[PDB]
Design a protein around this ligand. Structure first.
Ligand SMILES: Cn1ncc(NC(=O)c2ccccc2)c1C(N)=O
Ligand SMILES: [Cl-]
Ligand SMILES: [Cl-]
Ligand SMILES: [Cl-]
Ligand SMILES: [Cl-]
Ligand SMILES: [Cl-]
Ligand SMILES: [Cl-]
Ligand SMILES: [Cl-]
Ligand SMILES: [Mg+2]
Length: 348
């Protein structure tokens, strides 16, 4: 066990191993508080997150376990990984606080799409890296659920990491009105007409790619229904084949109240874009989720010929999510979390 030291920063007590020095508060959310620090063991600048009320309810205890399991599994160049996890507690009986350590990230994709002139080469490389990370994530049967520019870290060499996995957290209030929190969501989950599945992440990538090409949000709806109307004007209303597949009766009743619309010509929407970029967008932004391109298929698209290497696009180890269907007490989720904290083995 390392030696820990205590300090109060912004009315919050931080008790951390001596290896972490020069702690500086950087932000706070409902999830917890975050400090930047220097890690003397690895030489990395790191982000240290202290979880807020991690075991206050069954829902919150299960969410803490879910986050730690996901972060411990992810080992890929284009996905956030876990450098360390620790607790100052010396036994399960005094266990109360959880701290998570990752590489410190600077700019997100917002900080570049608004502020840079991107060449087509930049778009190729950025979307390539998102799809490389997504192939890995999806190969473990994980769904990200919240891909958007603020959840993509980028550095000065245009290298990208996927962050901030959806932990089943977002509220109804946070999705209401003219809000970027909803602009990247697939139409079939915006009003919960389908269960989440991996194809919803590919919709998000299409929305992001379009915005990198044009500098503008693709579907900036003022509310759920305005946004659906923007989507259907671009990709058309459902055809007979998709209508037959749609399982939600609420979806069918409302959708068939709208006048039918054909799919638009994407070459007249994304004026001046690389024809190969337009072709890939047509394959991602498909209304019928069953027919969207997959991440593995998209990596082999000719738009990425300059970067695609099928020997350097790895898949993930299997990921056991059977805990999601389990009903446990608060203290049982807490004990499972404690076991995962003390069993952590750092990367080389
Ligand atoms: C079997 N199946 N394949 C696709 C799909 N639905 C859709 O892709 C969809 C898209 C927009 C709005 C609502 C539904 C279904 C289904 N269970 O509804
Ligand atoms: Cl230490
Ligand atoms: Cl990382
Ligand atoms: Cl503790
Ligand atoms: Cl965003
Ligand atoms: Cl479904
Ligand atoms: Cl009509
Ligand atoms: Cl597993
Ligand atoms: Mg985020």
């Amino acid at each position: 066990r390392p030696t820990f030291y205590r300090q109060e920063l912004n009315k919050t007590i931080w008790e951390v191993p001596e290896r972490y020095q020069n702690l500086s508060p950087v932000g706070s959310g409902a999830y917890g508080s975050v400090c930047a620090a220097f890690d003397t063991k690895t030489g990395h600048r790191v982000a240290v997150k202290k979880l807020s009320r991690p075991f206050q309810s069954i829902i919150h205890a299960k969410r803490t376990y879910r986050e730690l399991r996901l972060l411990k599994h992810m080992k890929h160049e284009n996905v956030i990984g876990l450098l360390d996890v620790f607790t100052p507690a010396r036994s399960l009986e005094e266990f109360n606080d959880v701290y998570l350590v990752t590489h410190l990230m600077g700019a997100d994709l917002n900080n570049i799409v608004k502020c840079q002139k991107l060449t087509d080469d930049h778009v190729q490389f950025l979307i390539y890296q998102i799809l490389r990370g997504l192939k890995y994530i999806h190969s473990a049967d994980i769904i990200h659920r919240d891909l958007k520019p603020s959840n993509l870290a980028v550095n000065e060499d245009c290298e990208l990491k996927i962050l901030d996995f959806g932990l089943a957290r977002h509220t109804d209030d946070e999705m209401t009105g003219y809000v970027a929190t909803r602009w990247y969501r697939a139409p079939e989950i915006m009003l919960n007409w389908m269960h989440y599945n991996q194809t919803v992440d590919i919709w998000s990538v299409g929305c992001i790619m379009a915005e990198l090409l044009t500098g503008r949000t693709l579907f900036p709806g003022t509310d759920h229904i305005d946004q659906l109307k923007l989507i259907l004007r671009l990709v058309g209303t459902p055809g007979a084949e998709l209508l037959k597949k749609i399982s939600s009766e609420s979806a069918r009743n409302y959708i068939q109240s709208l006048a039918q619309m054909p799919k638009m010509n994407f070459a007249n929407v994304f004026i001046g874009a690389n024809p190969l970029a337009v072709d890939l967008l047509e394959k991602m932004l498909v209304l019928d989720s069953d027919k969207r391109i997959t991440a593995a298929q998209a990596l082999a698209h000719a738009y990425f010929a300059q970067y695609h290497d099928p020997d350097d696009e790895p898949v993930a180890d299997p990921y056991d999510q059977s805990f999601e269907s389990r009903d446990l007490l608060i203290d049982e989720w807490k004990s499972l979390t404690y076991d995962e904290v003390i069993s952590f083995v750092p990367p080389p």
